[PDB]
Amino acid sequence: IIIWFLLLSVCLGSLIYSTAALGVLMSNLGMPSYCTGYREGYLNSTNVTIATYCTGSIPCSVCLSGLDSLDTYPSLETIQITISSFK
Amino acid sequence: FPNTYLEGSVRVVTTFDSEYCRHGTCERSEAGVCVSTSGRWVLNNDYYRS
Amino acid sequence: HVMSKHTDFSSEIIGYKAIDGGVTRDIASTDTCFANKHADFDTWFSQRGGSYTNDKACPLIAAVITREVGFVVPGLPGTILRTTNGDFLHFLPRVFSAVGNICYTPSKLIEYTDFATSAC
Protein backbone atom coordinates (compact mmCIF):
# COMPACT_ATOMS: atom_id res chain seq x y z
CA ILE A 1 0.00 0.00 0.00
CA ILE A 2 2.72 2.46 1.02
CA ILE A 3 5.27 0.64 -1.15
CA TRP A 4 3.65 2.07 -4.28
CA PHE A 5 3.97 5.60 -2.88
CA LEU A 6 7.60 4.98 -1.90
CA LEU A 7 8.39 3.69 -5.40
CA LEU A 8 6.64 6.72 -6.93
CA SER A 9 8.73 9.03 -4.75
CA VAL A 10 11.90 7.16 -5.75
CA CYS A 11 11.06 7.40 -9.46
CA LEU A 12 10.28 11.12 -9.14
CA GLY A 13 13.60 11.62 -7.36
CA SER A 14 15.40 9.72 -10.12
CA LEU A 15 13.77 11.90 -12.79
CA ILE A 16 14.70 15.02 -10.81
CA TYR A 17 18.30 13.81 -10.59
CA SER A 18 18.25 13.21 -14.35
CA THR A 19 17.06 16.79 -14.86
CA ALA A 20 19.84 18.00 -12.54
CA ALA A 21 22.41 16.08 -14.60
CA LEU A 22 20.92 17.67 -17.73
CA GLY A 23 21.37 21.06 -16.05
CA VAL A 24 25.00 20.26 -15.24
CA LEU A 25 25.56 19.29 -18.88
CA MET A 26 23.87 22.59 -19.77
CA SER A 27 26.22 24.62 -17.57
CA ASN A 28 29.10 22.73 -19.19
CA LEU A 29 27.96 22.95 -22.84
CA GLY A 30 25.28 25.63 -23.21
CA MET A 31 22.40 25.05 -23.16
CA PRO A 32 18.67 25.12 -23.94
CA SER A 33 17.34 22.69 -21.32
CA TYR A 34 14.55 22.08 -18.83
CA CYS A 35 15.40 24.37 -15.90
CA THR A 36 16.47 27.26 -18.18
CA GLY A 37 13.23 29.20 -17.79
CA TYR A 38 13.23 29.16 -13.99
CA ARG A 39 16.85 30.32 -13.76
CA GLU A 40 16.34 33.02 -16.40
CA GLY A 41 13.30 34.34 -14.55
CA TYR A 42 14.97 34.17 -11.15
CA LEU A 43 18.18 35.94 -12.19
CA ASN A 44 16.30 39.05 -13.36
CA SER A 45 13.82 38.89 -10.46
CA THR A 46 14.23 40.79 -7.20
CA ASN A 47 13.32 37.79 -5.00
CA VAL A 48 16.37 37.19 -2.79
CA THR A 49 14.81 34.02 -1.35
CA ILE A 50 13.71 30.86 -3.14
CA ALA A 51 10.85 30.20 -0.70
CA THR A 52 8.80 33.12 -2.03
CA TYR A 53 9.75 32.33 -5.64
CA CYS A 54 8.98 28.60 -5.89
CA THR A 55 6.25 28.79 -3.20
CA GLY A 56 7.48 25.51 -1.71
CA SER A 57 7.10 23.48 -4.91
CA ILE A 58 9.55 20.60 -5.23
CA PRO A 59 10.57 20.60 -8.94
CA CYS A 60 11.03 24.38 -8.91
CA SER A 61 13.12 24.11 -5.74
CA VAL A 62 15.42 21.41 -7.12
CA CYS A 63 15.75 23.14 -10.48
CA LEU A 64 17.50 25.93 -8.54
CA SER A 65 19.73 23.55 -6.56
CA GLY A 66 23.40 24.50 -6.53
CA LEU A 67 22.84 28.26 -6.76
CA ASP A 68 23.53 30.89 -4.11
CA SER A 69 20.69 32.12 -1.92
CA LEU A 70 20.15 34.34 1.11
CA ASP A 71 19.02 31.30 3.12
CA THR A 72 22.57 29.88 3.05
CA TYR A 73 23.89 32.41 5.59
CA PRO A 74 23.52 31.25 9.22
CA SER A 75 25.26 34.35 10.57
CA LEU A 76 22.30 36.58 9.63
CA GLU A 77 20.11 34.96 12.29
CA THR A 78 19.75 36.41 15.79
CA ILE A 79 18.61 34.08 18.56
CA GLN A 80 16.55 35.94 21.16
CA ILE A 81 18.31 35.76 24.54
CA THR A 82 16.94 36.64 27.99
CA ILE A 83 19.55 38.30 30.22
CA SER A 84 20.23 37.25 33.82
CA SER A 85 17.37 38.16 36.14
CA PHE A 86 18.84 39.14 39.52
CA LYS A 87 21.14 38.38 42.47
CA PHE B 1 11.40 50.57 24.33
CA PRO B 2 10.71 52.95 27.22
CA ASN B 3 9.52 56.53 26.91
CA THR B 4 12.23 59.18 26.73
CA TYR B 5 12.33 62.96 27.16
CA LEU B 6 15.88 63.78 26.00
CA GLU B 7 18.12 62.10 23.43
CA GLY B 8 21.76 62.70 22.58
CA SER B 9 24.90 62.69 24.69
CA VAL B 10 22.74 62.75 27.84
CA ARG B 11 19.52 60.76 28.17
CA VAL B 12 16.63 60.61 30.64
CA VAL B 13 14.28 57.62 30.63
CA THR B 14 11.18 56.43 32.47
CA THR B 15 10.27 52.82 33.19
CA PHE B 16 7.32 50.75 34.37
CA ASP B 17 6.96 47.43 36.17
CA SER B 18 7.23 45.36 32.98
CA GLU B 19 10.01 43.74 30.99
CA TYR B 20 11.41 45.66 28.03
CA CYS B 21 13.00 43.95 25.05
CA ARG B 22 15.23 45.09 22.20
CA HIS B 23 16.80 43.39 19.18
CA GLY B 24 17.89 39.97 20.42
CA THR B 25 17.85 40.84 24.14
CA CYS B 26 14.90 41.04 26.53
CA GLU B 27 15.47 42.46 30.00
CA ARG B 28 13.42 42.95 33.16
CA SER B 29 13.24 46.33 34.87
CA GLU B 30 11.27 48.10 37.59
CA ALA B 31 9.41 51.39 37.46
CA GLY B 32 11.46 54.52 38.04
CA VAL B 33 13.57 57.23 36.41
CA CYS B 34 17.19 56.95 35.33
CA VAL B 35 19.76 59.53 34.21
CA SER B 36 22.95 58.66 32.34
CA THR B 37 25.96 60.80 31.44
CA SER B 38 26.52 58.73 28.26
CA GLY B 39 24.41 57.38 25.42
CA ARG B 40 24.75 53.79 26.62
CA TRP B 41 21.71 51.58 27.19
CA VAL B 42 20.14 52.12 30.60
CA LEU B 43 17.60 50.09 32.57
CA ASN B 44 16.55 50.07 36.22
CA ASN B 45 18.17 47.04 37.87
CA ASP B 46 21.09 46.17 40.12
CA TYR B 47 23.30 45.19 37.17
CA TYR B 48 23.04 48.61 35.54
CA ARG B 49 22.96 50.37 38.92
CA SER B 50 26.42 48.95 39.70
CA HIS C 1 27.38 26.42 -4.04
CA VAL C 2 30.92 27.76 -3.62
CA MET C 3 31.64 31.45 -3.06
CA SER C 4 33.51 33.24 -5.85
CA LYS C 5 35.46 36.48 -6.07
CA HIS C 6 34.22 39.36 -8.23
CA THR C 7 35.79 42.70 -9.10
CA ASP C 8 32.74 44.67 -10.31
CA PHE C 9 32.32 48.16 -8.84
CA SER C 10 35.81 47.95 -7.29
CA SER C 11 36.65 51.61 -7.98
CA GLU C 12 33.59 52.76 -6.01
CA ILE C 13 34.67 51.13 -2.72
CA ILE C 14 36.41 53.06 0.05
CA GLY C 15 36.63 50.28 2.65
CA TYR C 16 35.05 47.17 4.12
CA LYS C 17 32.88 46.36 7.14
CA ALA C 18 31.90 43.14 8.90
CA ILE C 19 28.40 41.85 9.68
CA ASP C 20 28.09 39.56 12.70
CA GLY C 21 24.85 38.19 14.11
CA GLY C 22 22.76 40.32 11.77
CA VAL C 23 24.35 43.54 13.09
CA THR C 24 27.24 45.36 11.45
CA ARG C 25 30.39 45.70 13.56
CA ASP C 26 33.97 46.87 13.19
CA ILE C 27 36.80 44.53 12.21
CA ALA C 28 39.72 43.44 14.39
CA SER C 29 43.00 41.75 13.53
CA THR C 30 42.63 39.08 16.24
CA ASP C 31 39.63 37.47 14.51
CA THR C 32 40.45 34.33 12.54
CA CYS C 33 37.56 33.40 10.23
CA PHE C 34 35.36 35.46 7.92
CA ALA C 35 32.96 34.97 5.04
CA ASN C 36 34.27 37.03 2.15
CA LYS C 37 33.07 37.86 -1.36
CA HIS C 38 35.82 40.34 -2.34
CA ALA C 39 39.40 39.84 -3.50
CA ASP C 40 40.63 43.29 -2.44
CA PHE C 41 39.85 42.34 1.16
CA ASP C 42 42.91 40.09 1.00
CA THR C 43 45.10 43.12 0.25
CA TRP C 44 43.23 45.10 2.92
CA PHE C 45 44.01 42.49 5.58
CA SER C 46 47.53 41.72 4.33
CA GLN C 47 48.63 45.36 4.62
CA ARG C 48 47.56 45.09 8.28
CA GLY C 49 49.16 41.65 8.61
CA GLY C 50 46.00 39.56 8.88
CA SER C 51 45.14 36.08 7.65
CA TYR C 52 41.91 34.10 7.64
CA THR C 53 40.16 30.93 6.50
CA ASN C 54 37.02 31.12 4.36
CA ASP C 55 33.89 29.52 5.82
CA LYS C 56 30.14 30.10 5.68
CA ALA C 57 29.75 30.03 9.49
CA CYS C 58 31.76 33.24 9.99
CA PRO C 59 30.87 36.95 9.79
CA LEU C 60 30.29 38.35 6.31
CA ILE C 61 32.24 41.22 4.75
CA ALA C 62 30.43 44.24 3.30
CA ALA C 63 31.96 47.22 1.49
CA VAL C 64 31.16 50.89 2.07
CA ILE C 65 30.28 52.50 -1.28
CA THR C 66 29.63 56.11 -2.29
CA ARG C 67 27.08 55.17 -4.98
CA GLU C 68 23.45 54.11 -4.57
CA VAL C 69 23.64 50.43 -5.56
CA GLY C 70 21.08 47.67 -5.11
CA PHE C 71 17.69 47.72 -3.42
CA VAL C 72 16.42 47.59 0.16
CA VAL C 73 15.13 44.34 1.64
CA PRO C 74 13.35 44.49 5.03
CA GLY C 75 15.32 42.89 7.85
CA LEU C 76 18.71 43.16 6.14
CA PRO C 77 21.33 45.86 6.78
CA GLY C 78 22.67 47.95 3.93
CA THR C 79 21.72 47.07 0.36
CA ILE C 80 21.79 43.84 -1.64
CA LEU C 81 23.09 43.55 -5.20
CA ARG C 82 23.14 40.45 -7.41
CA THR C 83 25.92 39.94 -9.94
CA THR C 84 25.46 38.88 -13.55
CA ASN C 85 26.62 35.40 -12.51
CA GLY C 86 23.87 35.13 -9.87
CA ASP C 87 26.04 35.76 -6.81
CA PHE C 88 24.73 38.28 -4.28
CA LEU C 89 26.70 41.20 -2.86
CA HIS C 90 26.31 43.47 0.16
CA PHE C 91 27.15 47.17 0.42
CA LEU C 92 26.73 50.06 2.87
CA PRO C 93 25.46 53.16 1.05
CA ARG C 94 25.81 56.55 2.70
CA VAL C 95 24.71 60.15 2.22
CA PHE C 96 27.59 61.84 4.07
CA SER C 97 31.22 60.78 4.39
CA ALA C 98 31.17 60.71 8.22
CA VAL C 99 29.35 57.38 8.46
CA GLY C 100 30.44 54.19 10.18
CA ASN C 101 27.68 51.78 11.15
CA ILE C 102 24.24 53.27 11.75
CA CYS C 103 21.42 51.75 13.79
CA TYR C 104 17.80 52.86 13.95
CA THR C 105 16.06 54.22 17.03
CA PRO C 106 12.26 54.60 16.90
CA SER C 107 12.68 58.36 16.36
CA LYS C 108 16.18 59.22 15.09
CA LEU C 109 19.36 57.69 13.67
CA ILE C 110 22.45 57.52 15.89
CA GLU C 111 25.87 56.06 15.14
CA TYR C 112 27.43 53.51 17.48
CA THR C 113 30.73 51.77 18.16
CA ASP C 114 29.30 48.65 19.84
CA PHE C 115 25.74 47.33 19.55
CA ALA C 116 25.77 45.85 23.06
CA THR C 117 26.32 49.24 24.75
CA SER C 118 24.35 51.62 22.53
CA ALA C 119 20.84 53.04 22.23
CA CYS C 120 20.25 50.83 19.17
CB atoms within 10 A of CB C65: 21
Q: Report how far residue C8's alpha carbon sits from residue C84's, in angstroms, rounded to the nearest whole number.
A: 10
3-state secondary structure of B5: strand
Q: Which residues contact C11 (CB under 8 A, 6 or more apart)?
A: none
- The enclosing H or E element of C11 equals none
Evaluate whether B23 touches A78 at the Cβ level (below 8 Å).
Answer: yes
Q: Report how far residue C32's alpha carbon sits from residue A15's, in angstroms, rounded to the nearest whole number.
A: 43
Return the bridge partners of C65, or none: C13
Burial of B2 (0-12, 13-18, 19+ CB in 10 A): middle
Q: Report how far residue B50's alpha carbon sits from residue C81's, in angstroms, rounded to the nearest whole number.
A: 45
DSSP state of C48: T
Is beta strand C53-54 parallel, antiparallel or unpaired with respect to C33-34? parallel
Sign of torsion, CA C75 C78 C83 C85? negative
Q: Report how far residue C12's alpha carbon sits from residue B4's, in angstroms, rounded to the nearest whole number.
A: 40
Q: Subunits that touch chain B (at least 3 Cβ pairs < 8 angstroms)?
A: A, C
Q: Report how far residue B40's alpha carbon sits from residue C39's, in angstroms, rounded to the nearest whole number.
A: 36
Query: Is A44 within 8 Å of chain C by CB?
Result: no
Q: Report how far residue C110's alpha carbon sits from residue A80's, in angstroms, rounded to the nearest whole number.
A: 23
3-state secondary structure of C88: strand
Q: Do B27 and A79 touch (CB under 8 A)?
A: no
Nearest CA in chain B to A83: B27
Q: Report how far residue C90's alpha carbon sits from residue C68's, in angstroms, rounded to the nearest whole number.
A: 12
Q: Do A83 and B24 touch (CB under 8 A)?
A: no
Instruction: Say what the resolution is, in angstroms.
Output: 4.2
A66 sits in the region (left: phi over 0; alpha: psi -120 to 50; else beta) called left
3-state secondary structure of C63: strand
Query: Is B25 within 8 Å of chain A by CB?
Result: yes
DSSP state of C116: G
Q: Report how far residue C60's alpha carbon sits from residue C16's, in angstroms, rounded to the nearest whole number.
A: 10
